[PDB]
Design an enzyme around this catalytic site. Structure first.
Site, short mmCIF file in Angstrom:
data_model
loop_
_atom_site.label_atom_id
_atom_site.label_comp_id
_atom_site.label_asym_id
_atom_site.label_seq_id
_atom_site.Cartn_x
_atom_site.Cartn_y
_atom_site.Cartn_z
N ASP B 84 20.38 41.64 -28.30
CA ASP B 84 19.10 42.26 -27.98
C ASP B 84 19.19 43.14 -26.74
O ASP B 84 20.09 42.97 -25.93
CB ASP B 84 18.04 41.19 -27.78
CG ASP B 84 18.49 40.06 -26.89
OD1 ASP B 84 19.71 39.83 -26.78
OD2 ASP B 84 17.62 39.39 -26.32
N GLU B 154 18.58 36.72 -25.99
CA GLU B 154 18.96 36.25 -24.66
C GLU B 154 17.92 36.59 -23.62
O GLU B 154 17.72 35.83 -22.69
CB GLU B 154 20.30 36.84 -24.25
CG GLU B 154 20.81 36.43 -22.87
CD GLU B 154 20.25 37.27 -21.74
OE1 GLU B 154 20.00 38.48 -21.95
OE2 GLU B 154 20.07 36.74 -20.63
MN LIG Z 1 22.05 40.42 -20.36
#
Ligand SMILES: [Mn+2]
Ligand SMILES: O=C(O)c1cc([N+](=O)[O-])ccc1O
EC number: 3.5.99.8
Lengths: 212, 209
Positions: B84, B154
């Site tokens: 991401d 994340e």
């Molecule tokens: Mn990162």
């Protein structure tokens, strides 16, 4: 009113300590702008109070909404933040004048901001109201018993649909029972509603029998 | 030495490293829509024979786990980066210029590679994808497995109030999900940007409304 700041930083990198008006967080700067705007508003309603035959207009100001940025992504503070202001006008105030006043409040704080209007409507005092005024007055004294009194300022200083009628040349006033919901009143007396309906009917019987 | 062979192998892979980083960074993948990026990494690992699996909570937001298998009898090492990215074109509420370029694209100029999507994190991910390729193709001797773990979610987006479910979840369906479902190893190197400085403490967080 959108206040700008930045640069965006991930929370572990945010600079501290920093002066509020210098904050990279637009939310922080806006908070400072809000108290400046509230004092400006305190003086606005007094400076632009104005008496008309149809009532005294006390134009008030409120901050109705705030946002910046989004609640579901908070790991970086916003580079911008917006406020949404309801500013009432007396019939004789140009909207652009008010916008410059607000631009000036911002300017005094050294902030970079966008002051953008997204609604403008004019308020009016009725012209040639006497026939309706009189027809109603007659009815009112019959049903209620005394001459009519001058209206409370908040009920003169709002938006009601007398404005479209007046704007379009249909002389128009407002009249009913009870305190305004903006007050906030939460009930009517059944006896007073009946009184009003009587006044409405009587008003009609007078006025609708005049030749235009 | 069997090391030097890999180093010279890596000297020759400069171009694939660049291409992989740029192709990867170019993919639209803000948190919440990392699927397409996952697909690229899956198919990349497949072509290079790392036998990848999709490990995820949703069919369009998943982690990608593949391996470089060892001869036997060694410690396992994970390499970890996330799929991401930070900026969505959606986010006009957080950025003054939501549609810049540095926020969404990735390109090779001069001796640099530009783009937030590359710094974080496509990026360090390209670095070890190539490193893994070099080891395999140089036929380096390894007793233990190398685990290649590319994760979703994340970045610290979290659901709250009326913003619930698939579109707003992040870390709960990312790395810890992968690890809990097979992506285990003896040790793990998380490839993100430090300045060639190792860190092995990290902070927690509490979000307050
Ligand atoms: Mn990162
Ligand atoms: O007539 C009113 O009192 C009135 C009040 C509100 N308000 O309190 O929001 C809105 C429209 C109204 O006409």
């Amino acid at each position: 009113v959108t206040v700008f700041a930045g640069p965006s930083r991930y929370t572990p990198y945010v600079p501290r300590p920093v002066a509020a008006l210098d904050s990279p967080n637009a939310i922080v700067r806006m908070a400072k702008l809000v108290e400046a705007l509230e004092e400006w508003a305190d003086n606005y309603e007094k400076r632009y109070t104005r008496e008309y035959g149809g009532g005294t207009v006390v134009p008030k100001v409120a901050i109705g909404a705030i946002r910046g940025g989004v609640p579901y992504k908070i790991y970086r503070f916003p580079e911008l933040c917006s406020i949404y202001m309801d500013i009432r006008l007396n019939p004789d105030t140009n909207p652009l004048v008010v916008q410059r006043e607000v631009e000036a409040v911002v300017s005094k704080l050294g902030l970079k901001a966008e002051v953008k209007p997204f609604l403008f409507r004019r308020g009016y005092e009725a012209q040639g109201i006497e026939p309706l005024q009189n027809a109603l007055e007659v009815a009112h004294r019959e049903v209620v018993g005394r001459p009519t009194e001058r209206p409370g300022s908040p009920e003169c200083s709002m938006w009601r649909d007398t404005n479209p009628y007046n704007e379009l040349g249909i002389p128009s006033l407002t009249y009913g029972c009870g305190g305004g919901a903006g007050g906030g009143n939460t009930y009517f007396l059944v006896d007073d509603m009946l009184k009003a309906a009587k006044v409405y009917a009587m008003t009609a019987m007078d006025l609708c029998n005049r030749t235009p | 030495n069997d090391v030097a062979k890999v180093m010279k192998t890596l000297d020759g892979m400069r171009e694939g490293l660049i291409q992989t980083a740029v192709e990867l960074g170019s993919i639209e993948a803000p948190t919440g829509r990392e699927g397409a990026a996952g697909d690229y990494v899956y198919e990349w690992m497949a072509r290079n024979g790392f036998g990848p699996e999709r490990v995820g909570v949703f069919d369009d937001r998943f982690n990608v786990v593949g391996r470089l298998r060892g001869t036997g009898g060694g410690a396992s090492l994970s390499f970890n980066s996330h799929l991401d990215t930070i900026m969505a074109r959606e986010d006009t509420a957080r950025f003054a210029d939501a549609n810049d370029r540095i926020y969404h694209e990735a390109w090779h100029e001069e001796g640099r590679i530009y783009g937030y999507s590359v710094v974080n994190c496509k990026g360090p991910m390209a670095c070890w994808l190539i490193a893994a390729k070099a080891l395999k193709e140089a036929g380096a001797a390894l007793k233990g497995d190398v685990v290649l773990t590319a994760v979703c979610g994340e970045i610290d987006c979290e659901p709250v109030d009326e913003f619930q479910g698939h579109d707003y979840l992040a870390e709960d369906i990312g790395a810890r999900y992968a690890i809990s479902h097979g992506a285990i190893s003896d040790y793990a190197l998380v490839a993100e940007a430090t300045n060639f400085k190792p860190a092995w403490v990290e902070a927690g967080k509490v979000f307050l409304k």
